[PDB]
Amino acid sequence: TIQLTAQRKYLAEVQALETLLTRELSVFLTEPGSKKTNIINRITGKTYALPSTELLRLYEHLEQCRKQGALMYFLERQGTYSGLMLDYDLKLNTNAVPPLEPPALSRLCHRIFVHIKNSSVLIHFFFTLKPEVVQGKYGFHVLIPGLKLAASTKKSIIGSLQHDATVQKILHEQGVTNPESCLDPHSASVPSLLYGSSKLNHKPYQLKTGFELVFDSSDPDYIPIHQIKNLESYNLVSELSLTNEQGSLVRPV
Amino acid sequence: HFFFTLKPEVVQGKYGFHVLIPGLKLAASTKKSIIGSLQHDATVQKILHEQGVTNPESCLDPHSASVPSLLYGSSKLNHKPYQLKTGFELVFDSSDPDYIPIHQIKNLESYNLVSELSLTNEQGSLVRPV
Amino acid sequence: IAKVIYAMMGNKFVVDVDSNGKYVWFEFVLPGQPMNQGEIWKWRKEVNPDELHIYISENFSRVMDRITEHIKYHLSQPHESNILNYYKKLLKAFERSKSKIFNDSFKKGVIRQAEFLFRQRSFIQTLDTNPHLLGVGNG
Question: Which family would the database say this protein is a member of (chain C) (predicted)?
């Protein structure tokens, strides 16, 4: 708790964010039970339904805050249209680093692409992982903010991946003793956290790599995978925002 | 390993395209069969037509693999040498070779490119003798 | 600070001069605060203003925080160098005054100064003069 005060003291950007919350967001107040809210910070239990300008301003401000470090507990809840939020509870047998090589993540991308082609189609990828050094090893979250298909189709995809065994085999390549149950079925049905908004007494996940497969509508079996470079020259908090339909790097598919 | 280079253009008869695949070792009549297959191939011609190419065939010489070639950097008589355009690292699988990701290759800059692109240099760092 | 305090709560304290010449303090009680039994909605004689000191120390500190954040805000925007130096000097002289609201002697001096502003002449002499009003337990 003292660290919060220390951050409030020796960080001007924290004071700027607090002033922003107190005055500009004092008009976009949202009821605790209403679902119209899009951004929620659990530090004070504040619910917000900020417009696009307010959303982007918060994104950039939290980006500057995260660049210096600091702590925060912001959360966002998916609407009727949103991206895909994923969680892996990879409780490995040994707490030794299973280096996630880009080929393995590419295999995951191919598998999920196959699992989604049998659905509505017309893409950016971001891989962020736990800092490890903990019992049960780390966890993994992948984010797909390009499209907008927040419906029962997401639950169908989750169920398809639940019985999926190729991803289990890929996990077994790294020595994962938990091939299944790592993916919670509520991956896309729960509010998520913005990049940098860690857990209570837990380090935030750090982004590992990103990928940029080109979307084509001529073949339902082709599986291209391209890789983005130079993410550091971007507003990562803004880029990874699901509601950020106006993101710079990404597009609203 | 995939490598792409382009002519500096601005010349009669347009430019030329060279792609280099030093990974494999199959220099035999199989290459002639491949050339024959690509001669009747239209998918590459269709790709070229997207670029306004009015020479879909006769661009690929029938002796594309039965004539000596030039190392990277070597030019043509009274012509500029071909400069590298891009490169790709599409994965190869021996069991289910349908994998077609076109993985973006990296670190092409800090390599001994003349050593890597050589056909007879099986011990290159970037490429391997598959 | 006495002017600010008087503006902030000029409705809960009245100062009058007694016969013996000592300034005295009365406050109008409100429900939901520590008190005796059955004296709501009535003035009570108070030798030394207690709630006033705590109010000065903490409630008034919020306005100080507002001033500090406003100064930081105006320091945020790009401006000329000279105005930036002016704001820096203003803040650097300012923060020292913040602690003085906790010093006991400073608070005593503020109370003594505010004794003038809160005064309302002919208050004690008119106290309880109307015979038609009765002080009861429930108001």
Answer: Belongs to the asfivirus helicase C962R family.
Residues of chain A with C-beta less than 8 angstroms from the C-beta of B104: 212, 226-227, 229
* C107 to chain A, closest Cα gap in Å: 27
Assigned token pair, C75: 């320091």
How many Å apart are CA A227 and CA A233, to the nearest integer? 15
Q: Print burial letters for A150-167: b (CB count within 10 Å at least 16), e (below 16).
A: beeebeebbeebeebeeb
CA A15 to chain centre: 26
This PDB structure is determined at a resolution in Å of 3.3
> How many angstroms from the chain centroid is the CA of residue A45?
21
Query: How far apart are alpha carbons A166 and A111 in whole angstroms?
Result: 7
Cβ of C73 within 8 Å of Cβ of A19? The answer is: yes
Nearest Cα to Cα of residue C42 among C14, C77, C1: C14
Joined together, the tokens standing for residue B106 give 């990296």
Nearest residue to A145 (alpha-carbon basis) of A253, A231, A36: A253
Q: Which two tokens stand for residue A148?
A: 């907008």
* Distance spanning both ends of chain B, measured CA to CA: 10
Phi and psi torsions of A86, nearest 5°? -130, 150
* Distance between start and end Cα atoms, chain A: 41
Interface mutation vs chain B, best among A225, A226, A228, most B CBs within 10 Å: A225
Q: How far is CA A4 from CA A63, A69, A70, C86, in A?
A: 18, 12, 8, 30
CA distance C31 to B37: 96
Beta strands in chain A (DSSP E): 39-41, 46-48, 74-76, 84-85, 124-129, 140-144, 192-193, 206-212
Cβ-contact A175, A98 below 8 angstroms? yes
Neighbouring-strand partners of residue A142: A127
Name every residue whose Cβ is closer than 8 Å to that of residue C127 and which is 6 or more positions away in sequence: C43
By the 8 A CB rule, do A211 and A231 touch? Answer: no
Q: Which chains touch B (3 or more CB pairs under 8 A)?
A: A
A226 with B89: CB under 8 angstroms? no
Please state, in angstroms and rounded to a whole number, the distance separating the CA atoms of residues B20 and B69.
11
CA C18 to chain centre: 22
CA A193 to chain centre: 7
Helix (H, G, I), strand (E, B) or coil at A4: helix
Nearest CA in chain C to A12: C72
List, as one string, the DSSP characters of A135-169: TT---EEEEE-S----SHHHHHHHHHHHS--HHHH
CA distance B1 to B44: 19
Which tokens sit at A50? 């900020």
What end-to-end distance do the CA atoms of chain C give, in Å? 33
